[PDB]
């Protein structure tokens, strides 16, 4: 068994599970973390080589499956239920499962409990909140407005979506970027900027710096950012994203998944390592010890991890969020929407103009 997993994940822990398997089966298990493995896999797998198992964000696997690089996994009915229903929706291509969900990540609302003990449950009340805070020389909310990943939660709340999903299949042509839901969300976002509750030039570093030094009461970010806030010693909380028009914000969900190489002769063997040795309380903890997985797809262990409210919030937002389409056309989406939001935010284009371009640019029709 040869496995590829990113170097920023707890590969030492996954290797301990490897040691276990070997000592509990005999087959040796090597866990590598080559540089730029997500690009190396599709090249090496096209020659019938590569690892037996590959760990990476699900969004990449749809491209892999399309090239027949991934073997279809066959999780029994009983196993499916061990994991959260929505996580399986992230590892399907053409309705067929091509990977095992491992961990789950999504944006959450991060807030300063000293400046804002009562974080907003709705987007609509943030303007009023910012008005109160601006008297104290502070702002209600600062977050990266440069990347669609961060602004999509709001834009999508009222019915926006990248590509239509159903039966483990995305419709390249059905794009929900310029629908009434998206226009309502982006309009509210632009109005926050127009009324100067936020600045159109706010990016990741600016928002991060502002929150960690207590200049803004809220920000939007993922589990990766927590470590920098801990060092800032700001008394922060992590909670559910605000609703828009009675709808939950829909952050994109990233699911660290494990695929089986189509060229591997150890398909059923890899299935036993993932289902019976990695995807257990013991397996996931062995990895989590080396480097925190955040929220996990396995119900049993997630319920233990969720004792940390920050992880609990991550899962909650993920369950309410939009699974990131795993299809290559998503590159077009990121590209087009990134320009539309920046343009709508700067007044360079109107909301309608910006999203129409994005709709077309993403490969859809008005």
């Amino acid at each position: 068994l040869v496995i590829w997993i990113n170097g920023d994940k707890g590969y030492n822990g996954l290797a301990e599970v490897g040691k276990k398997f070997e000592k509990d089966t005999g087959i040796k298990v090597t866990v590598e973390h080559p540089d730029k493995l997500e690009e190396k896999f599709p090249q090496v797998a096209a020659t019938g080589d590569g690892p037996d198992i590959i760990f990476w964000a699900h969004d990449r696997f749809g491209g892999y499956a399309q090239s027949g690089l991934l073997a279809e996994i066959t999780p029994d009915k009983a196993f499916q239920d061990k994991l959260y229903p929505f996580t399986w929706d992230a590892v399907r291509y053409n309705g067929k499962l091509i990977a095992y969900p491992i961990a789950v990540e999504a944006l959450s609302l991060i807030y300063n409990k000293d400046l804002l003990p009562n974080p907003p449950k709705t987007w609509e009340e943030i303007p009023a909140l910012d008005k109160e805070l601006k008297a104290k020389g502070k702002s209600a909310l600062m977050f990266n407005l440069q990347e669609p990943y961060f602004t999509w939660p709001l834009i999508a709340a009222d019915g926006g979506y990248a590509f239509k999903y159903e039966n483990g299949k995305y419709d390249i042509k059905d794009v929900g970027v310029d629908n009434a839901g998206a226009k309502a969300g982006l309009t509210f976002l632009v109005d926050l900027i127009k009324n100067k509750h936020m600045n159109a030039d706010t990016d990741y570093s600016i928002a991060e710096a502002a929150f960690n030094k207590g200049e803004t009461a809220m920000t939007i970010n993922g589990p990766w950012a927590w470590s920098n806030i801990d060092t800032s010693k700001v008394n922060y909380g992590v909670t559910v994203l605000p609703t828009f028009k009675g709808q939950p914000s829909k952050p994109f969900v990233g699911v660290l998944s494990a695929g089986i190489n189509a060229a591997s002769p150890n398909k059923e063997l890899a299935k036993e390592f993932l289902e019976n040795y990695l995807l257990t309380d013991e397996g996931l903890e062995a990895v989590n010890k080396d480097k925190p997985l955040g929220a996990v797809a396995l119900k049993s262990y997630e319920e233990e991890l969720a004792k940390d409210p920050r992880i609990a919030a991550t899962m909650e937002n993920a369950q309410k969020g939009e699974i990131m389409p795993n299809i290559p056309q998503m590159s077009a989406f990121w590209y087009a929407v990134r320009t539309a939001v920046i343009n709508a935010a700067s007044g360079r284009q109107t909301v309608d103009e910006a999203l129409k371009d994005a709709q077309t640019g993403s490969g859809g029709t008005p």
């Binding site: 009023a128 008005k131 632009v190 127009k194 009324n195 100067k196 159109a200 700067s346 007044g347 360079r348 109107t350």
Partner: protein
């Protein structure tokens, strides 16, 4: 305005009347504008600082300057509930019926956020009560939709 202009915008935003005084004394352009058409008078009307607004106006600040969104200083003053500022802007020839990109006017904004006293002064200066925005909503409709009781009634009487 380049170096001093950017500083003047920042001083206006931060409500630093002293810094603004000093910057203007060093040749800062009162009608400076960033790429989005935001001028010191916009940010001053947003800061809620009266002295700075009066100072900008005296130095020749254009009261009806529009930013990229169609916002004048009066729009921001109304939206941010700065009554005194609204009165000064109007006193200096502010267009009371100034309309933004989405058809919003100062009356719409004042009516939306329950700024009764600001709604009054605006109506006093001829604010159009029958002005529909891009959604066909009048300032009265906004007062109703946002549960602003006393303001919905005044706008009604005015209409009739």
């Amino acid at each position: 305005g380049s170096d001093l202009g950017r500083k003047l915008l920042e001083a206006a935003r931060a409500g630093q009347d002293d810094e603004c005084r000093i910057l203007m004394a060093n040749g800062a352009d009162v009608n400076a504008a960033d790429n989005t058409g935001t001028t010191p008078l916009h940010l001053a009307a947003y800061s809620g600082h009266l002295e700075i607004v009066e100072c900008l106006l005296k130095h020749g600040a254009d009261v009806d300057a529009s930013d990229v969104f169609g916002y004048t200083p009066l729009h921001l003053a109304a939206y941010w509930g700065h009554l005194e500022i609204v009165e000064v802007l109007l006193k200096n020839g502010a267009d009371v019926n100034a309309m933004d990109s989405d058809g919003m006017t100062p009356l719409h904004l004042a009516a939306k956020w329950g700024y009764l006293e600001i709604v009054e002064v605006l109506l006093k200066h001829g604010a159009d009560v029958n002005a529909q925005d891009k959604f066909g909503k009048t300032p009265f409709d906004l007062a109703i939709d946002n549960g602003n009781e006393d303001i919905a009634e005044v706008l009604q009487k005015a209409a009739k």
